[PDB]
C-alpha cells in the first residue's frame, strides 16, 4: 500500500518508472491495431516480420480420437517424453518422464542436442515397452521453436529463441536430424508430426473444451496459435493439393513473440534495449523479450543496477553478484510480490542470501513496486496478441486456452490479464469467469496435443489425404 517513509528523491524515481512501464487502455488498443496489420502481413504473399507458420492441422478434433501415442516435448525446464492414451470420448490418460538438460545445451552443438534427445527416447521406450513392439510407435514431436513446415513431419528451424544458441541448426530440417539419431539407437519410433507448443495447446484444449479458439503460451516464451481458413492464407495460394480446399481450417503457429521487431509501437525502454542488444539474437523476438518469463527478472536486474549506478540504492553494498546477466530469474519478482510481510522480510532474506546485498525497508518497497510494474506491463502487453487474433478473425467470444510458467505461477497474473482484456473492450462484467474473451487453463499441448495431432495425421495418411503442400 503505503509509502510515507520513502524520501521525495526516491519517490521521484519510482514515479518515473511507473510512467515508463504503465500501459494505458488506449495504448493497448493502438498496439492491437498495429498487431492485426502485422498478423495479416505475415500471411501475405510477400510475408512480414511475424512468421505466421501453417501447422498442417486442417480439422478440429472430434473427441472420438483413440489410441496410444508417444509425445516428445522439447522446451520445458526438462526434456519430457510422454505416453498418451486417447480414450475416444474427449478423455485421455498419460504417464511421463522428465530428463535434465545437459549443462550448456543451449550453447552446445547440434550433435549434442540430437544425441541427448535420442538417448532419452530409447530410455523411455525400453522402460515402457521392455518386450519390444510389433510396429513402430507413432510419435508427435513438440519443437517449441519457430520451424517452417512444407509438410507436417518437417520443421526447418527459423531462429533460436529463449536464450538458445546451438550452431548448425538454424536453416536445417530438424526432423531428419532427430530421425538419424533414433535410427542409430534402433528405437522403433515413427515420427508422424512436428508441432509447435501453441498448436498443441490449441488442439488438446479443443478436445475437451469446444469453445477454445486460441492456444497460447505465457511462459519461458510468449506465442499463440489459432485456426484460420485456407482462403485467408494468401501465401498458400497455388501451393495446396486439391483435397485441402478454400474453406478448410488451418491451424497457424503465429510466432507472435516476434511482433514489432521494427520498434514502431511497443513502449520499449532503455532496459528493453539492453536486453535485446545483449541477447543471443539481437533484433529478434521484441514482444516476447518485453513480456515472457525468461526476461522479467532481467528487466528488474537492469533497473536495479541503473538505480545503483545513478547513486540511489544499495549505496554501501558490494553489488558484484548483481552484474551477472540473467542471475535474477522470474522467481525473484514472484517471491517479492508474494512476500506477505509489511516490511518485506522475505525480500530481505532473498537479496541477502542469494545476492549478498543488504537492503533498507524503503529500498524493498521500491523493489516490490518495480516487480509489480514489470508484471503488470507484461500482462497488458501480452493480451494484445489475444485481442489482435480475436478482432482479426471476428471472435467476440472465445475461450483462450493458456499455459506456461507465467500464466500458471506468476502471482496475480491471471487477474491482471483478465482486467487488461476488460479494459480493451470496456465490458461491465464483474467476475473473471464471465468475460466474453477469457483465458482458461489449457490441456497439455506439448504432450496430449502432439498425440492428438499425430492421431489426426495418421488418419489423414491412411485415407490418402494431404498433410503438406502439393508435391510433398
Ligand atoms: O514456448 C513458447 C514459445 O516460445 C518462443 O516464442 C518460441 O519461438 C515459440 O515457438 C514457442 O511457442
Ligand atoms: Cl534518497
Ligand atoms: Cl510460412
Ligand atoms: Cl527509457
Ligand atoms: Cl464469437
Contact call for residues 139 and 72 (beta carbons, < 8 A): yes
Residues 414, 396: Cα–Cα separation, whole Å? 20
Cα–Cα distance for residue pair 332/272, rounded to 1 Å = 18
75 lines ligand 1 (CB under 6 A): yes
Query: Long-range contacts made by residues 271-279, C-beta under 8 angstroms, separation at least 24?
Result: 271/299, 271/302, 271/303, 271/306, 272/299, 274/302, 275/299, 275/302, 278/325, 279/163
CB 198 within 8 A of CB 224: yes
- Cα separation, 350 vs 313, in Å, equals 17
Q: Which residues surround ligand 5, an ion (CB under 5 A)?
A: 395-397
Domains and their CATH numbers in the chain? 1-63 (1.10.287.1250), 64-196 (3.30.420.40), 197-472 (3.40.367.20)
Task: Enumerate residues preceding breaks in the chain (C to N > 2.5 Å).
Answer: none
Q: Please tell me whether 98 is known to bind a ligand.
A: yes
Task: Find out whether 390 and 435 touch, Cβ atoms under 8 Å.
Answer: no
Kindly list the distances between the CA atom of residue 74 and the CA atoms of 82, 87, 99, 183, 311, in Å, as whole numbers in the listed order.
12, 25, 10, 19, 43
Pairing between strand 92-100 and 78-87? antiparallel
From 163, 198, 223, 288, mutation site for ligand 1 pocket: most ligand atoms within 8 A of C-beta = 223
Q: Contact, 300 vs 373, CB < 8 A? A: no
Residue 159 known to be catalytic? yes
Residues 6+ apart with CB under 8 A from 21: 267, 269, 373, 374, 376, 377
Q: What is the 3-state secondary structure (H, E, C) of 160-181?
A: CCCCCCCECCCCCEHHHHHHHH
272 lines ligand 1 (CB under 6 A): no
At which residue does the C-alpha cell 513438440 appear?
142
| b/e burial code for range 250-284 (CB count within 10 A of at least 16 → b) | bbbbbbbbbbbbeeebbeebebbebbbeebebeeb
Span from the CA of 468 to the centroid of ligand 3 (angstroms): 12
Nearest protein Cα to ligand 1, atom 8: 145
Residue nearest to atom 9 of ligand 1 (CA): 145
Q: Measured from the CA of 285, which atom of ligand 1 is nearest?
A: 6
Burial of 29 (0-12, 13-18, 19+ CB in 10 A): middle
110 is catalytic: no
Verify whether ligand 1 is closer than 6 Å to residue 201 (CB atom): no
Q: Compute the distance between CA of residue 445 and CA of residue 198 in angstroms, rounded to an integer.
A: 7
Tell how far the Cα of 307 is from the centroid of ligand 1, in angstroms: 32
| Contact call for residues 216 and 401 (beta carbons, < 8 A) | yes
Cα-to-centroid distance, 343 and ligand 2 (Å):
18
3-class SS letters over the chain: CCCCCCCHHHHHHHHHHHHHHCCCHHHHHHHHHHHHHHHHHHHCCCCCCCCCEECCCCCCCCCCCEEEEEEEEECCCEEEEEEEEEECCCCEEEEEEEEECCCCHHHCEHHHHHHHHHHHHHHHHHHHCCCCCCCCEEEEEEECCCEECCECCCCEECCCCCCCCCECCCCCEHHHHHHHHHHHCCCCEEEEEEECHHHHHHHHHHHHCCCEEEEEEECCCEEEEEEEEHHHCHHHCCCCCCCCCCCCEEEEECCHHHCCCCCCCCCCCHHHHHHHHCCCCCCCCHHHHHHCCCCHHHHHHHHHHHHHHCCCCCCCCCCHHHHCCCCCCCHHHHHHHHCCCCCCHHHHHHHHHHHCCCCCHHHHHHHHHHHHHHHHHHHHHHHHHHHHHHHHHCCCCEEEEEECHHHHHCCCHHHHHHHHHHHHHCCCCCCHHHCCEEEEECCCHHHHHHHHHHHHHHHHHHCCCCCECCCC
Whole-number Å distance, alpha carbon 424 to ligand 4 midpoint, is 25
Query: Would you say 326 and 298 are in contact if contact means Cβ atoms under 8 Å apart?
Result: yes
Q: What is the resolution of this structure in A?
A: 1.4
- For the question of residue 316 being annotated catalytic, the response is no
**Technique that determined the structure:** X-ray
| Cβ neighbour number for residue 145 with a 10 Å cutoff | 22
Helix axes 25-43, 413-425, angle to 10 degrees: 90
205-229 burial: b if 16+ Cβ within 10 Å, else e: bbbbeeebbbbbbbbbbbbbbbbbe
Amino acid at each position: 500500500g503505503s509509502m510515507a517513509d520513502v524520501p521525495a528523491n526516491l519517490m521521484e524515481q519510482i514515479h518515473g518508472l511507473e510512467t515508463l512501464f504503465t500501459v494505458s487502455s488506449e495504448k493497448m488498443r493502438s498496439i492491437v491495431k498495429h498487431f492485426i496489420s502485422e498478423l495479416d502481413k505475415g500471411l501475405s504473399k510477400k510475408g512480414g516480420n511475424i512468421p505466421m507458420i501453417p501447422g498442417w492441422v486442417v480439422e478440429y478434433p472430434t473427441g472420438k480420437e483413440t489410441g496410444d501415442f508417444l509425445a516428445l516435448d522439447l522446451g520445458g525446464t526438462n526434456l519430457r517424453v510422454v505416453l498418451v492414451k486417447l480414450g475416444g470420448n474427449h478423455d485421455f490418460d498419460t504417464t511421463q518422464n522428465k530428463y535434465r538438460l545437459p549443462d550448456h545445451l543451449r550453447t552446445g552443438t547440434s550433435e549434442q542436442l540430437w544425441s541427448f534427445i535420442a538417448k532419452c527416447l530409447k530410455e523411455f521406450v525400453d522402460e515402457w515397452y521392455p518386450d519390444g513392439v510389433s510396429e513402430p510407435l507413432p510419435l508427435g514431436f513438440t519443437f517449441s521453436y519457430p520451424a517452417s513446415q512444407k509438410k507436417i513431419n518437417s520443421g526447418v528451424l527459423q531462429r533460436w529463441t529463449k536464450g538458445f544458441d546451438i550452431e548448425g541448426v538454424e536453416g536445417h530440417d530438424v526432423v531428419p536430424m532427430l530421425q538419424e539419431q533414433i535410427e542409430k539407437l534402433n528405437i522403433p519410433i515413427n515420427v508422424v508430426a512436428l508441432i509447435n507448443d501453441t498448436t498443441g495447446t490449441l488442439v488438446a484444449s479443443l478436445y475437451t473444451d469446444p469453445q477454445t479458439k486460441m492456444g497460447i503460451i505465457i511462459g519461458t516464451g510468449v506465442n499463440g496459435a489459432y485456426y484460420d481458413v485456407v482462403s485467408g492464407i494468401e501465401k498458400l495460394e497455388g501451393l495446396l493439393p486439391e483435397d485441402i480446399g478454400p474453406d478448410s481450417p488451418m491451424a497457424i503457429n503465429c510466432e507472435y513473440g516476434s511482433f514489432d521487431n521494427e520498434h514502431l509501437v511497443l513502449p520499449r525502454t532503455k532496459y528493453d534495449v539492453i536486453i535485446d542488444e545483449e541477447s543471443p539474437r539481437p533484433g529478434q523476438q521484441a514482444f516476447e523479450k518485453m513480456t515472457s518469463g525468461y526476461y522479467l527478472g532481467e528487466i528488474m536486474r537492469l533497473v536495479l543496477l541503473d538505480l545503483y549506478d545513478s547513486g540511489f540504492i544499495f549505496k554501501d553494498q558490494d553489488i558484484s553478484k548483481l552484474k551477472e546477466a540473467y542471475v535474477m530469474d522470474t522467481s525473484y519478482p514472484s517471491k517479492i510480490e508474494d512476500d506477505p510481510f509489511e516490511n518485506l522480510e522475505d525480500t530481505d532474506d532473498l537479496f541477502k542470501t542469494n545476492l549478498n546485498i543488504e537492503t533498507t525497508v524503503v529500498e524493498r518497497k521500491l523493489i516490490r513496486k518495480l516487480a509489480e510494474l514489470v508484471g503488470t506491463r507484461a500482462a497488458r502487453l501480452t493480451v494484445c496478441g489475444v485481442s489482435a487474433i480475436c478482432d482479426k478473425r471476428g471472435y467476440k467470444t472465445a475461450h483462450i486456452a493458456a499455459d506456461g510458467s507465467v500464466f500458471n505461477r506468476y502471482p496475480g497474473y491471471k487477474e491482471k490479464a483478465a482486467q487488461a482484456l476488460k479494459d480493451i473492450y470496456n465490458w461491465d462484467v464483474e467476475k473473471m469467469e464471465d468475460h466474453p474473451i477469457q483465458l482458461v487453463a489449457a490441456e497439455d499441448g506439448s504432450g496430449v496435443g502432439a498425440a492428438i495431432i499425430a492421431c489426426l495425421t495418421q488418419k489423414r495418411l491412411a485415407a490418402g489425404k494431404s498433410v503438406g503442400i502439393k508435391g510433398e
